[PDB]
Amino acid sequence: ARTKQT
Amino acid sequence: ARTKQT
Amino acid sequence: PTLPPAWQPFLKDHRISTFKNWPFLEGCACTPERMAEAGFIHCPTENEPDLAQCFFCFKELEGWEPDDDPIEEHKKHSSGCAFLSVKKQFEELTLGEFLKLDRERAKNKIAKETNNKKKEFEETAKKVRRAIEQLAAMD
Amino acid sequence: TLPPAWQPFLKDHRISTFKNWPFLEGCACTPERMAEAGFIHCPTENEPDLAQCFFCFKELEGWEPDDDPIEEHKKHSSGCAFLSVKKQFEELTLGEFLKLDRERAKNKIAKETNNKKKEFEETAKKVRRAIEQLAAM
Ligand SMILES: [Zn+2]
Ligand SMILES: [Zn+2]
């Protein structure tokens, strides 16, 4: 997975 | 000391 | 905030702090430090202003004398109290140990409430029984 | 049994947070595994697979079935103290536990602060743009 954006 | 009463 | 209210009595500093107007201070064997080290919280009433309670086994003791050693009094009056066996300091307990102790405290609290309700009920039973004997007696 | 604020320390609490998790049996990132890695489930409208470490507050979306939650946590948040904790909860001393909760408290403030930074930087962009447009005509 990856780092929440916005 | 002694136990509480009532 | 940092420890929940229900668990504060586990802490000596909390317990000491409950002794706002304890009569026995320096010169006496039962000082607040010593009462607290023994498990006691201060519970003063109108009728008994020196009333103390173990936070763990809920034994209540009044009529304190200056030479009274709170540990020996606790040992004498409530020998079965697990807290007397706790040799480690709070921070040094494992959570399993701590949770085990809080379960035992909860059981002690229930045992105390229950024993109370019993004695109150038995007393009501005596009243009612008497009242009914009186009526058979008049009869 | 334990105060709300401290429940997330407990695996069984964390698992319970996975109400509608897509990746179930046969997958590497199951709820048991997510929970063992520290994750709590935080689904939004926009990101329904959103997960957060309860301890360092790292947020990760875009989970794939073969994802190993521990390696993802290690990768994305290498310094998270929770990854060092080898002992089981019951086996911690209260001192150890209280130490960890202090660190979590700091982590939370660090995160709130990093958030406020990003929000401020975003308002600054808007204000800069407005002023340019106004200076233009
Ligand atoms: Zn006791
Ligand atoms: Zn983390």
Residue D36 sits in a domain whose CATH number is 1.10.1170.10
Selected for mutation to probe chain A from D29, D59, D67, D74 (highest A CB count within 10 Å) is D59
8 Å CB contact of B4 and C77: no
- The rounded distance, in Å, linking the Cα atoms of D133 and D126 is 11
The structure tokens listed for B5 are 């009463």
Handedness of CA D66, D83, D11, A3 (dihedral sign): negative
Buried-state track D92-104, b at ≥16 Cβ within 10 A, e below 16: bbbebbeebeeeb
Cβ-Cβ contacts under 8 Å, C60 against chain B: 3-4
The amino acid at D133: Q
* Domain range for D31: 1-137
Q: Do chains D and B touch (3 or more CB pairs under 8 A)?
A: no
Tell me the C-alpha distance between C134 and D86, whole Å: 73
Interface check D51 vs A, CB under 8 A:
yes
CB contact set of C75 (below 8 Å; sequence gap of 6+): C84
Separation in Å, CA C138 to CA B2, C124, C125, C131, C134 = 42, 21, 20, 11, 6
Residues of A within an 8 Å Cβ radius of D = 1-5
Cβ of residue D45 closer than 8 Å to a chain C Cβ:
no
Of the candidates C6, C61, C8, which has an alpha carbon nearest to the alpha carbon of residue C35?
Answer: C61
Phi-psi region of D57 (alpha: psi -120 to 50; beta: other; left: phi over 0): left
Task: Please state the φ and ψ torsions of residue C62, each to the nearest 5 degrees.
Answer: -125, 175
The rounded distance, in Å, linking the Cα atoms of D17 and D21 is 9
Helix (H) or strand (E) holding D131: helix D94-136
- In angstroms, rounded to a whole number, what is the distance separating the alpha carbons of residues C117 and C51? 21
Number of domains forming the structure of chain C: 1
Alpha-carbon distance D118 to nearest alpha carbon in chain A (angstroms): 9
Experimental technique used to determine this entry: X-ray
